[PDB]
A paper describes a structure:
A rather recently identified group of PTLBs are the R-type “diffocins” from Clostridium difficile, which constitute the only Gram-positive R-type PTLBs known to date. All R-type PTLBs consist of an inner needle-like rigid tube surrounded by a contractile sheath. Binding triggers extensive conformational changes in the baseplate, accompanied by contraction of the sheath, which, due to extensive interactions, drives the rigid inner tube into the cell envelope. Here, we have determined the crystal structures and SAXS envelopes of the R-type diffocin tube and sheath protein [name] and [name] in their pre-assembled monomeric state.
The R-type diffocin tube protein [name] crystallized in space group P43212 containing one molecule in the asymmetric unit. [name] possesses a compact fold with a central β-barrel flanked by two α-helices at both of its open sides. Whereas α-helices α2 and α4 cap the β-barrel on one side, the α-helices at the other protrude away from the β-barrel such that α1 covers the β-barrel of a symmetry-related neighbor. Higher B-factors indicate increased flexibility for α1, which hints at structural changes that may occur during tube assembly. As was suspected from the molecular replacement process, [name] shares highest structural and sequence similarity with XkdM from B. subtilis as well as with gp104 from the bacteriophage φ812 tail tube, and the overall fold for these proteins is mainly preserved. Notably, in XkdM, α1 does not protrude away from the core of the structure such as in the crystal structure of [name] discussed here, but rather caps the β-barrel of the same molecule, again suggesting a high degree of flexibility for this region in both [name] and XkdM. Particularly, a prominent loop (K33–G58 in [name]) is variable and folds into a flexible α-helix in [name] (α1), XkdM from B. subtilis and HCP1 from the T6SS of B. pseudomallei, whereas these residues form a protruding β-hairpin in FIIR2 as well as in gp19 from bacteriophage T4. Notably, in the tube protein [name], α1, which interacts with a neighboring molecule in the crystal structure, sticks out of the calculated envelope. Comparison reveals that the architecture of the central β-barrel mainly remains unaltered in the assembled tube whereas positions of α-helices α2, α3, and α4 are significantly changed.
Residue numbers in the entry: 7 to 49, 52 to 142
The structure:
Amino acid sequence: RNVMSGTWGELWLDGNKVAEVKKFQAKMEFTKEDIIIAGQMGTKYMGYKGKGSITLYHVSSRMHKLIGEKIKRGSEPRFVAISKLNDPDSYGAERIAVKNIAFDDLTLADWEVGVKGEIEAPFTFTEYDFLDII
């Protein structure tokens, strides 16, 4: 409905291709904190928090090291997913880039399960772009 979803694609950590994507679903949410800002006297758009689930496979053997380097630098890792949209005609686009993705609960062992198997994880995101316009 107001939920976006997609199937095949790729997951990236900066310039590194780190997994393939089987599917995703995402929803945008109005929070009370966003409601306060939009009501400020002194200004028709509103901030939003993105949340979803994504299913990953063919995880890179380099994920362990890439995450360790993020921790060393002090930077929580932020990803990009590219995926084939469901119902592309409704969007006027065939693919989506879901950006600034955070995985609050994915562990090193979860990444491990996704090398030879598949892993479904919740995620948050803050922006997106439509790709392959039609």
